[PDB]
Structure formats: C-alpha cells, structure tokens
Amino acid sequence: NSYKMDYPEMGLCIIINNKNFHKSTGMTSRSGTDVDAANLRETFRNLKYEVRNKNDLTREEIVELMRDVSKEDHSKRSSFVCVLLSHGEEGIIFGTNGPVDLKKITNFFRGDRCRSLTGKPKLFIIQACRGTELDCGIE
Amino acid sequence: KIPVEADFLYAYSTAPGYYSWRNSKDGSWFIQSLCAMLKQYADKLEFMHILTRVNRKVATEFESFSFDATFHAKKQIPCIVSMLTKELYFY
C-alpha cells in the first residue's frame, strides 16, 4: 500500500541553502549551490509543495527554523520535505558559523514530537560531505 | 503503535564516509540528477525507483574534473536510507 497523498496540501519544502560561511570557520564558498536551490524550488513547486527557500543560515538559525517548522500544524499536509545544501561531515550539516548534528534536526519531526506528521513521510535530502574518502571508480 | 523513527527517508548525496561533489556552474551532481529524475518521472514512478535512477545517473554520467590530481577523476554514488513503511507517489 501507499502513503495518503491527497491531503489538502502536499506539504512544506524547506530548502536551506548555505553558500557563504564566516571567515572564522575557514570554509569556502559553495559556488553552484544557487543553481541547485533554484532548480529544487522549481521542481517542488511543480509537485505542488509549499516551498520555502532559506539562504545562509547560522547553526542557531537552522535549529530554531526546524523547531518552529516542527511546531507548525501539518494536519492538512500529506508530507514534509527538507533539503539541506551545505558543507558537511558524517551525520553533520554545516551552518554558516559552525556544525549541526543531523539527528538534532531530524529529531524535531519524530512521530512522538511532531504529532501532526506521525504516519506521514518525512523526506530529508542532504547534499553535503559525509567524510573525506574518495571513490576512484572502476571501468 | 509505530516506531518514532519510522516514516523517515534520508536521501544522501553520497555514500557514508565519502566526499560529495559539486560543479561550480551546473550545481551539485546529486541535486542536478534529483531534479531531472523528479521532473521526468514523478508522475510515473514510485519515489524509491526515482531515487534509484538518480543513483545510476550520478554514478554513470558524472566524473570529477580538477587540476589537482588528488581531486581529479573521482566518482560518486548517492545513498538512499529509507525507514518508510509505505510506497510514495507524488500523484
């Protein structure tokens, strides 16, 4: 069987687009990420999602955003989509001023913490590194 | 009752422990492919099958180009992590 996708709304699409980072982090600009954020915006607009583009959020700004979104009323929404575009590590996404645990972000939307999304698909699309290993490929 | 970790899907751009690649003009390999496959198949395929096609696209159609030999000719496979309990269609 399949998830009920004929609620009044399809749901939110939260795009967090981090391109520029504070010099204290020493992290470089992620050129090309604006192309991503705009293409995602168009794609999910056509999928009838309520898209919200966010640019250059700090670690603190990301947390409060995801928290506030989790305390919204998704009762008439079919699903939830979050897209993260930034620097990363294994289990870590980077805000403009420092690292954020992915678990902390996702934990806001657990079945017992976001009651209005319980039983509904919660999609997290992550574009970030997960370490420093290189895939050399094979013919 | 249901698990509190159920009904999550994590679409990772790359495998655990690995780099994720991004083109300065076209955008990242994963998001490029994701939007393309969604645009083409969201009204025909289930989401896991769409992401599988995203996987084959990133894996077969992308290879890194760098003047730095350390970062040149590298590959990337995305990583679908599904704790979903039902099939997902966008229609």
Binding site: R30, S31, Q127, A128 | Y19, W21, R22, S24, S64, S66
Partner: peptide, 4 residues
C-alpha cells in the same frame, strides 16, 4: 568540480 569541488567537494563539500
């Protein structure tokens, strides 16, 4: 082509 750059890494993240």
């Amino acid at each position: 082509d750059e890494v993240x």
